[PDB]
Amino acid sequence: PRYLKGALKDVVQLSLRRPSLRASRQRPIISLRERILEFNKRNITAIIAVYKRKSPSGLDVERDPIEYAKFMERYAVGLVILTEEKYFNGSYEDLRKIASSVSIPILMWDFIVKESQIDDAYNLGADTVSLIVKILTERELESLLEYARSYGMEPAIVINDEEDLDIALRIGARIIIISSRDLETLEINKENQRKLISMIPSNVVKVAASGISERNEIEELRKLGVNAFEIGSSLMRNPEKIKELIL
Ligand code: NA
Ligand code: NA
């Protein structure tokens, strides 16, 4: 991984030791990227709803993962399921239960630093995984990206600054998540998020993440070329808010 410090260094060290699992995938790969593009063509707002029980940026919410995913299946373009355990209270069992229950695309969000974590995502039923530029070297990014594609997965590349975006382009990213939240400081900077979006080629699928809570924000980001919107804590607290955000 990169040279890190503090809690980011901690979660990366823990992820390096994450025990792998054994299971049989019993699901096709259902591409998040393609379904975004399909929603864009049908002029349907594409919201990726996040399931996360805990985070550094919110209070805990303990709610049924299957109900949440079944409710979201009718509205969301895909689901993001947290599997990081210490800081997000996620689990691979959340992802397994949800993947077994619904047929929309699923992104496993975790600090992916080794190949066995991509095996775990594939074997559990995730369609894609988050590759976070803040923690991975160029060499690690290129290698894990190729390994995920060997399973037929197209990872989402997570960025929050210009240097991250340059690396995401260098590695041939096809879907980028532009998060307005800095993973180390938890600051939300939407001016920087718009500047990053303006520098991404038109043929890369763009997902805006963090701090989105209003239909007016979505409309304005769509007009700037954003293709989909990752929305977490607002929907964890009030899942049915998705109906209004898509209207
Ligand atoms: Na290990
Ligand atoms: Na787990």
Which amino acid is present at 170?
R
| φ, ψ at 216 (rounded to 5°) | -65, -35
CB contact at 8 A, 199 and 161: no
Alpha helices in 73-126 (DSSP H): 92-101, 115-124
Number of neighbours of residue 152 by Cβ within 10 angstroms: 12
Whole-angstrom Cα distance, residue 55 to residue 75?
Answer: 24
For residue 26, the CA-to-ligand 1 centroid distance in Å is 25
For residue 60, the CA-to-ligand 2 centroid distance in Å is 18
CA 59 to chain centre: 20
Alpha helices in 88-240 (DSSP H): 92-101, 115-124, 138-150, 162-170, 190-198, 215-223, 233-237
Nearest ligand, measured from the Cα of 110: 2
Whole-angstrom Cα distance, residue 49 to residue 235?
Answer: 7
The resolution in Å comes to: 1.5
For residue 21, the CA-to-ligand 2 centroid distance in Å is 9
CB contact at 8 A, 208 and 178: yes
The token pair that represents 9 in the structure block = 């260094």
Nearest to 61 by CA among 238, 244, 241, 245: 238
Domain 1-247 has CATH 3.40.50.300: no
For residue 84, the CA-to-ligand 2 centroid distance in Å is 8
3-state secondary structure at position 79: strand
Q: Which residue numbers come right before each break in the chain (C to N over 2.5 Å)?
A: none
Please tell me what DSSP assigns to residue 199. T
For residue 20, the CA-to-ligand 1 centroid distance in Å is 7
Nearest to 76 by CA among 98, 57, 49: 49
Whole-angstrom Cα distance, residue 67 to residue 90?
Answer: 16
CA trace torsion 127, 133, 135, 136 (10° rounding): 80
Number of neighbours of residue 113 by Cβ within 10 angstroms: 22
Whole-angstrom Cα distance, residue 193 to residue 160?
Answer: 7
Number of neighbours of residue 198 by Cβ within 10 angstroms: 9
